[PDB]
Amino acid sequence: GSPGPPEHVRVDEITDTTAQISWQEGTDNHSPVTAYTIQARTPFSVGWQRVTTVPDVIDGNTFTTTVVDLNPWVEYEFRVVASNKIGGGEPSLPSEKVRTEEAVPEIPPAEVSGGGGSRSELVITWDPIPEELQNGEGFGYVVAFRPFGTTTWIQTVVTSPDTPRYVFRNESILPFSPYEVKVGVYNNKGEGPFSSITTVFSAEAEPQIAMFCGKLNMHMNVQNGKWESDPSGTKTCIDTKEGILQYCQEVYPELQITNVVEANQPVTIQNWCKRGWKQCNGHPHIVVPYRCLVGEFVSDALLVPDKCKLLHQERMDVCETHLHWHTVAKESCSEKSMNLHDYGMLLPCGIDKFRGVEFVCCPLA
Amino acid sequence: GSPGPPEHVRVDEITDTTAQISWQEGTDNHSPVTAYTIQARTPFSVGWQRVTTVPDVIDGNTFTTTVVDLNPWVEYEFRVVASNKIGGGEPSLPSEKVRTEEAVPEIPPAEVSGGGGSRSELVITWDPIPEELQNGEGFGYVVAFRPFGTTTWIQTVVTSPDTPRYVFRNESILPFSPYEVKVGVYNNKGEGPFSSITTVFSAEAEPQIAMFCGKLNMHMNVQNGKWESDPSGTKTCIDTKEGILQYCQEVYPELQITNVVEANQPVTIQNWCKRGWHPHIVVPYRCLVGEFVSDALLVPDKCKLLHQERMDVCETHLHWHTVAKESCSEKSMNLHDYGMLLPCGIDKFRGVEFVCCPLA
C-alpha cells in the first residue's frame, strides 16, 4: 500500500527566497518510505505545485529540507507527500500559512505607452504590476518623461500600485510633441529597475489663496494670473486648515477642492485691503500661499537636471505637516552634501497632512 | 499639415527577432518632422501595430533603426510613419514581406493535465501550441512522465503539433496511481523548455503477428495473451511488407490496422503447426492500430534522449536502428532503446527516437 500522509508539517527559518520545512513520517503501509516531495500553494498558483528543494532529492531518513526559489512577499502553504516502492501516497495536511520576507521589486511595468488628452497635456499609461510581483508593502511607480533632445528629466512618484496612468498638465507642452518616457518601480525595501525608454506623444495660473491677518484674503485668478481681493468684503485670515479648505471652495466654486497645501516658495503681494475694501494701501506683504488642490490627489512633477538625483520617502506610521517633510527633504540632501532643488508631498492622510515626501537633490558649484 | 509618407523603405539584417529598417523623408508640409514610428503587420497581428526599436526613440533626423522583440519564423510587413506639430502623418507604403529566421520554441504547452482511461493506462493531455508560437518547422512535443516520488523519466516524442494526447499503456501502471508529468516543445532548430510538473493520476497484450516459413503464421490473442495459430489454417510466411499488413488486418478484423513495424526484440513461440493444422525464436511484426503513437522510452539518470526527423528520407526499421546506434557511438555512449517516428509508408519511417546511455 501507498504511504500515509506525513504529519505536523511546520515552517521555520523563512526568508525572502528560501524556507525551512520539517515534517514527521506518517503511517507507512508495511513498506519503508523511500522519498519525500514538497508542494506549495499560494493565492496565485492554481492549486498545489511542486517546489525546488536543497538537496534536490529527499530520502526517507530525512525530515527537514530547504525550499528555494520562492517569490518574496507571497503567502505560502506547504505540504509533504511521501513515496513507497508501491507509489506516491496521500499528501499531508497543509502547513500554517506563512508569508515570505520582502525584497526589492525586479519587474518594471510592461506596455509603457500613452497619448491623447486635451491641449497642453501628456498622457502616460502603463500596465499595473500585479500583487505577486510587488515583493513588499509600499509598492509604487516612478514616472519619468522629457522632450526629445533634452537632458533634464521630469519625474513624479505614484504611490498607488493600481494606478495605470499619469497626466502631466503644463503650458510647457507643445502640440503633438514627442517625449522620452520610462516608468520604474519601488517598494519599502528599495528601488527597482526602470522600463526601457519609449516614445509617447503629447496631445494635439493655479488655484491659490493668500492671507495676511488684518487684510482681506487674496486669491489667484486662474484666468489672468493676477492676485485678486476677496469676492466678498469680509473674509479675513483663517485660523484652521479646514477653514482654508472652505475658502478655497468658496472662491473657486466651479472646482472640486479636496485638500490644501502650502506652496514651496513665498510670493510678494502688493495691494492688500481691509474689510469692505477700505484703506487699500500699496504696502507689500511676503506670504506663503495655500494651494487649493483639486479632485483626486496627484503628486507634483519635479525637474531632475543632469547629475541630480530623485529621492522619495513614505512612512505609514507618520502623518505630518508640509513643514515637517520640507525639513526631511532638506536634511536628507545635506547628508549627501547636496542642495534641495524641488520637492512635493506624497500620500495625504488629512487636510494638509501627508505621510511622505518626494524631492530632488543636486550638487553645488 | 501632417507630414507626408516616407519613401525608400528597406528591410535588412533579418534575424530571428531583429530587423534593420531604413527609410527616406517625404515632404514635411512646412513643419519639420520630429519623430518616426515603425509599424508591422503579420498574419497574427490585428492590423498594423507599433513595434519596439533600439533605441525606442527615433528623432526627425534619424533614418535607420533596429526593430527588436520580433516573433521568429513569422512573415512581417513594415511601414514608417512620420510626425510633426500637427500630428501623425500618412504611413509609408509597406515594405516587402519578410520572414524572420527560425529559433527554438520558447512557450511550453499550458493546461497540462490528464486522467481516466482503461486499466493499466495513464492518459496525458495538454493544449497544443498554435503555429504563432512554434518558431520553426518540425515543431513537436516531448512528453515525460514518472511514478510520483521517483527521479527517472519515461519520455516519448510527439511529432505532430496538433496532437494533444498521449496514452501510456504498460503492465507496470498501478490502478489510480499518482504520476509526475511534464510536456516540452522542440523544433528543427533545437529543444525548447518543459512545462511545470503536474500530478496526473492513472486510471482505475499487443496485437502482432509472427512468421516462420514452412509453418502456419502465429498471432497474439489479445484476450488471453497467448500465441495462436492461423485461424484460416492456410496462410504461410509472407515476403512483402504490404502482405504482412493485409495479414494483420485479416487476423484482427475488429481493429483498424494502419501500419506494421518490426519488433525491437525477438520472441520465443511454441506450438507451430503445418498447413491445415518445438519452439522457434522469431522477430514478430507489430500490427499498428489507428493513428501513429510513438513508443515510450526510459531515460535513466545520466542518459540523454535524442530524436531525429529527416523529411528527405523514408527508410526502414533497420536503417533507423543503425542511425540510433551510430549516433550514440559518436557520442561515446551506447544505444539503450529506440522507436520509429513519422511513418511515410508501410514499414517505412522518416525518423527515430532513441536513448543513449553511458557504457557503464
Side-chain angles (χ1 to χ4, degrees):
Chain A
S2 298
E7 307 175 12
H8 305 152
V9 182
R10 311 288 194 237
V11 189
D12 292 335
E13 286 186 357
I14 185 76
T15 68
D16 62 332
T17 290
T18 65
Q20 197 75 27
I21 307 295
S22 53
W23 61 92
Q24 186 165 342
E25 171 174 298
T27 295
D28 72 319
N29 283 277
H30 315 277
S31 179
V33 175
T34 185
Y36 281 110
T37 314
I38 313 296
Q39 293 179 343
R41 184 172 59 174
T42 75
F44 313 109
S45 67
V46 188
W48 292 97
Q49 307 296 331
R50 196 186 205 273
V51 293
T52 302
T53 53
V54 178
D56 195 14
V57 183
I58 304 171
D59 58 65
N61 192 42
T62 296
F63 307 103
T64 197
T65 193
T66 306
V67 178
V68 298
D69 293 328
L70 305 172
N71 195 341
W73 202 61
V74 168
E75 189 188 64
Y76 275 88
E77 271 180 335
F78 293 100
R79 71 180 191 180
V80 189
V81 189
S83 303
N84 254 0
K85 302 162 189 180
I86 301 270
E90 177 183 352
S92 69
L93 291 180
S95 75
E96 185 72 18
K97 291 226 261 287
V98 195
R99 177 180 304 267
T100 50
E101 288 182 339
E102 297 179 327
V104 291
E106 307 182 22
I107 300 302
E111 300 185 354
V112 172
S113 196
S118 61
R119 287 237 168 92
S120 286
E121 291 192 357
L122 176 56
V123 187
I124 297 179
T125 72
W126 62 89
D127 275 5
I129 294 295
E131 182 189 0
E132 61 269 25
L133 296 184
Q134 293 167 17
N135 278 2
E137 291 172 333
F139 182 84
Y141 306 93
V142 171
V143 187
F145 48 91
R146 64 180 175 183
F148 275 21
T150 61
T151 59
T152 291
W153 287 102
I154 317 171
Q155 313 185 24
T156 184
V157 174
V158 184
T159 66
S160 184
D162 313 326
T163 295
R165 77 168 196 164
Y166 169 79
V167 186
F168 181 49
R169 303 169 182 85
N170 184 13
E171 76 175 31
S172 60
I173 299 177
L174 297 185
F176 207 81
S177 186
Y179 280 72
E180 304 183 23
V181 180
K182 63 177 186 182
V183 188
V185 295
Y186 72 89
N187 62 9
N188 272 10
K189 287 290 294 181
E191 307 235 28
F194 277 86
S195 69
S196 295
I197 295 177
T198 192
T199 298
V200 171
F201 291 103
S202 304
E204 40 187 333
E206 282 302 89
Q208 315 161 248
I209 60 102
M211 305 188 302
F212 196 75
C213 294
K215 297 300 198 299
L216 283 181
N217 293 341
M218 298 286 155
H219 66 86
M220 175 63 63
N221 182 283
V222 290
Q223 305 223 92
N224 56 30
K226 307 168 187 174
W227 288 102
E228 291 185 353
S229 186
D230 184 54
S232 175
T234 60
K235 295 311 175 64
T236 179
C237 74
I238 299 155
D239 196 9
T240 77
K241 302 299 173 64
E242 298 80 28
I244 297 180
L245 188 67
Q246 300 173 282
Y247 189 63
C248 273
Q249 188 62 67
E250 179 182 358
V251 171
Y252 308 104
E254 308 297 304
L255 295 177
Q256 185 187 350
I257 307 297
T258 64
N259 216 327
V260 304
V261 61
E262 297 88 336
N264 291 10
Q265 295 296 331
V267 59
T268 303
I269 298 172
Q270 293 95 2
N271 312 315
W272 292 83
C273 291
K274 297 195 71 64
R275 307 172 196 262
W277 303 291
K278 302 186 298 182
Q279 308 178 40
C280 296
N281 38 61
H283 294 72
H285 286 133
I286 315 178
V287 302
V288 175
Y290 287 78
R291 295 165 58 190
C292 310
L293 304 182
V294 180
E296 176 74 305
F297 181 83
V298 169
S299 307
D300 294 349
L302 310 178
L303 294 176
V304 188
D306 190 73
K307 290 175 168 291
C308 300
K309 302 310 190 74
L310 168 83
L311 289 82
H312 60 82
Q313 157 185 345
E314 56 208 70
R315 305 195 56 192
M316 297 310 300
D317 49 326
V318 164
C319 187
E320 270 289 347
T321 58
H322 171 272
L323 172 59
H324 171 89
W325 295 115
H326 178 46
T327 307
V328 166
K330 193 187 189 64
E331 289 175 337
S332 185
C333 297
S334 288
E335 294 162 345
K336 307 164 188 60
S337 297
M338 305 178 78
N339 222 327
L340 178 63
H341 164 92
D342 201 357
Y343 69 101
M345 305 296 103
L346 298 182
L347 275 175
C349 45
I351 305 307
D352 204 359
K353 284 294 195 65
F354 312 91
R355 299 195 183 278
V357 60
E358 55 173 11
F359 56 103
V360 179
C361 307
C362 293
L364 313 167
Chain B
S2 63
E7 315 172 15
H8 210 265
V9 173
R10 301 295 183 262
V11 183
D12 296 317
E13 256 173 33
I14 306 171
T15 81
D16 57 329
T17 67
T18 292
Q20 194 75 19
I21 314 288
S22 58
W23 58 95
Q24 180 177 328
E25 182 176 297
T27 70
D28 58 1
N29 285 322
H30 310 84
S31 190
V33 173
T34 59
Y36 284 106
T37 302
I38 314 299
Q39 294 178 334
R41 184 173 55 182
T42 68
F44 315 102
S45 74
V46 191
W48 292 95
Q49 304 292 346
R50 191 190 187 281
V51 295
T52 308
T53 59
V54 168
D56 219 4
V57 288
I58 306 169
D59 61 1
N61 297 286
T62 295
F63 304 93
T64 177
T65 193
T66 306
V67 174
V68 302
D69 297 333
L70 298 184
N71 197 341
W73 197 60
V74 175
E75 191 185 53
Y76 274 89
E77 289 176 322
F78 300 98
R79 70 184 190 177
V80 187
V81 184
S83 306
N84 67 357
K85 192 179 59 174
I86 282 80
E90 198 195 282
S92 69
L93 295 180
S95 65
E96 191 197 21
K97 289 174 176 297
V98 297
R99 206 182 202 98
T100 41
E101 290 186 317
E102 293 182 338
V104 298
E106 314 287 342
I107 304 305
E111 306 281 55
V112 179
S113 179
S118 302
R119 220 169 293 102
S120 293
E121 291 187 8
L122 175 70
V123 179
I124 301 177
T125 60
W126 63 95
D127 272 338
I129 295 298
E131 184 203 351
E132 182 186 12
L133 304 178
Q134 296 174 13
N135 276 15
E137 299 178 353
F139 180 89
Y141 308 103
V142 177
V143 180
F145 46 90
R146 65 187 176 186
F148 196 95
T150 68
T151 315
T152 293
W153 286 111
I154 310 181
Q155 305 187 11
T156 183
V157 181
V158 184
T159 61
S160 177
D162 306 328
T163 295
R165 196 169 177 265
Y166 181 85
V167 182
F168 178 49
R169 189 181 179 187
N170 191 278
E171 54 91 41
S172 69
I173 301 170
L174 289 86
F176 207 64
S177 188
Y179 279 73
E180 282 186 330
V181 182
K182 64 175 189 179
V183 180
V185 295
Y186 75 92
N187 60 13
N188 291 337
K189 284 294 165 293
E191 194 93 352
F194 273 99
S195 64
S196 299
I197 295 174
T198 180
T199 298
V200 176
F201 284 84
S202 62
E204 316 293 345
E206 202 208 40
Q208 48 186 350
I209 61 100
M211 301 178 301
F212 186 91
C213 290
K215 325 289 285 184
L216 288 185
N217 304 335
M218 304 291 290
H219 71 91
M220 176 64 68
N221 183 276
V222 193
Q223 291 90 339
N224 57 35
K226 292 192 298 180
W227 297 94
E228 296 177 348
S229 185
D230 184 27
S232 173
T234 65
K235 305 310 185 69
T236 180
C237 67
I238 305 178
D239 287 351
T240 49
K241 300 304 180 64
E242 295 76 9
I244 293 169
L245 185 63
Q246 306 301 313
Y247 188 74
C248 275
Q249 190 63 76
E250 180 180 358
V251 163
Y252 308 100
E254 82 287 353
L255 304 179
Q256 177 195 6
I257 278 79
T258 58
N259 216 321
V260 299
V261 66
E262 286 91 345
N264 286 7
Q265 290 205 7
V267 301
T268 298
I269 300 174
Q270 306 181 79
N271 308 317
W272 291 83
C273 312
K274 275 224 177 178
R275 262 168 213 102
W277 303 17
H278 282 263
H280 289 269
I281 303 178
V282 298
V283 177
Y285 280 93
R286 307 165 59 177
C287 309
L288 301 188
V289 180
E291 290 162 89
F292 181 72
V293 180
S294 52
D295 291 354
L297 306 180
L298 185 66
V299 189
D301 197 65
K302 302 294 182 178
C303 308
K304 291 293 186 175
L305 175 81
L306 299 170
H307 53 267
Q308 179 175 339
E309 306 169 37
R310 306 276 294 278
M311 301 311 297
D312 50 316
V313 177
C314 185
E315 277 284 350
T316 181
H317 174 266
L318 177 69
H319 176 87
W320 294 114
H321 183 200
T322 295
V323 172
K325 188 169 44 156
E326 285 180 338
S327 174
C328 304
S329 290
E330 185 182 359
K331 286 178 159 293
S332 300
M333 303 166 87
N334 277 341
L335 178 58
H336 193 262
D337 207 355
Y338 64 99
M340 296 302 103
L341 292 182
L342 265 183
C344 49
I346 295 92
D347 202 1
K348 297 246 198 302
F349 307 88
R350 289 199 183 280
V352 66
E353 53 166 10
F354 58 100
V355 172
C356 300
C357 280
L359 307 180

